[PDB]
Design a binder for this molecule. Structure first.
Ligand SMILES: Oc1ccc(-c2ccc3c(Cl)c(O)ccc3c2)cc1
Ligand SMILES: Oc1ccc(-c2ccc3c(Cl)c(O)ccc3c2)cc1
Lengths: 9, 225, 225, 9
């Protein structure tokens, strides 16, 4: 999730 | 990237205000933790966007970007909070419609402590009359200094912002000697913000283990790190 | 009282080098924790005397003197540890007869993490080439800023030590811009010393609750508060 | 302990 926002958003 | 361009970049990166409604009835222990945990979660999402706009942040390794956010998310939240309550002594502006009074922090088992040191640090900031531009740098510095080749890059990024804070302060006009004094007085406050964060996250952790409110996804991931 | 004279008095407030009377020998888990707690306890006694030698400290209300010490003692302890370790990279000079390596800090669970924090912040001060006179001001500041009518005296006192640290930096003869940058990098590290502090207590307090660490009166009192 | 050392030298 944290990683998601960082790399996916 | 000149100090002014860095400050102007941070100003533009200022996340918008997360709107949340104060419960209709007077707070209960749950309703409040409910409102604070929800607010935090939403602000965290906006915080990640804000971070990726901090000159050179995205250049760091992902694992670094992660460690930084994991270790300072509460400080950045509370630094933003304090700033919002700046022109409202005794009052804590968690949001445009969610204004909390020092006394309301009694419906929560042991949060009044937190609310007090938050108001205190705020009063210090108000006393020192912290400026918007200074605030943007102090907040950005909190993130970069939470280091609690890529690392070397980190040092350079943090210096860039420090140069920016110095640049802003100089523009106040006060004597050089006084610029050092204000710069010093502003930074000494970072420890207080740091403390509140620790007793703020410890408190949050307890609540969860207490089941006093649901804490999941982003809010949870950040809690454990 | 000029900044130079204030830094002098701090040098004069410097506590003596403390040893734990432990003959050279490999460290175990129980042998290491007793040494660290026996050392901290001795240093604690010397720390009370130290602060009392800080101009105006005794002038404060007894309540303040206590609160200030009950909250910063661990930080002041680690700050001292870092200055003594500054020249022995990879080692933590707790005391002449108590030197520890990062690997030796593995015997005790969690300690390794703390050791890293201490070693990191230390090597960090090392790169900045921390000067003794700077160390004196910083440590004094840790005391006077651990605060979360009498207050004027404190602020006025904290202010003086800050003014003293600025002086020290100005005497190094470096650039003005660099004088601000150095002052900044130094104050930012307090956040790190404060972080390894909260963790240090957490670990110690956990050890206390388990009666695995010998009973030390001054140490216990300071921990409970 | 803290207070007595604070009030005595
Ligand atoms: O912008 C913001 C939004 C929320 C907070 C905040 C501060 C302290 C908190 C504590 Cl003690 C809790 O137990 C649970 C949630 C909390 C949330 C701080 C700044
Ligand atoms: O000058 C000094 C002397 C001792 C310490 C120190 C640091 C970490 C400690 C930890 Cl983690 C413990 O569990 C128990 C005791 C400790 C004592 C720090 C500075």
């Amino acid at each position: 999730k944290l990683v998601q926002l960082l790399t996916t958003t | 990237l000149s100090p002014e361009q860095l400050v102007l970049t941070l100003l533009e990166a200022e996340p918008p205000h997360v709107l949340i409604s104060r419960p209709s009835a007077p707070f209960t222990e749950a309703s409040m933790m409910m409102s604070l945990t929800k607010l935090a979660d939403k602000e965290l999402v906006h915080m990640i966007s804000w971070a990726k706009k901090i000159p050179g942040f995205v250049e760091l390794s992902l694992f670094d970007q992660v460690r930084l956010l994991e270790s300072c998310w509460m400080e950045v939240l509370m630094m933003g909070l304090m700033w919002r309550s700046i022109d409202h002594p005794g009052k804590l502006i968690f949001a445009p419609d969610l204004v909390l009074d020092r006394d309301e922090g009694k419906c929560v088992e042991g949060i009044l402590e937190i609310f007090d040191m938050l108001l205190a640090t705020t009063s210090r900031f108000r006393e020192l009359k912290l400026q918007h531009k200074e605030y943007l740098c102090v907040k950005a510095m909190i993130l970069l200094n939470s280091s609690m080749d890529s690392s070397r890059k980190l040092a350079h990024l943090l210096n860039a912002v420090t140069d920016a804070l110095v640049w802003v302060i100089a523009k106040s006009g006060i004597s050089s000697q006084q610029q050092s004094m204000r710069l010093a007085n502003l930074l000494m406050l970072l420890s207080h913000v740091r403390h509140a964060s620790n007793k703020g996250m410890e408190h949050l952790l307890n609540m969860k283990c207490k089941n006093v409110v649901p804490v999941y996804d982003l809010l949870l991931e950040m809690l454990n790190a």
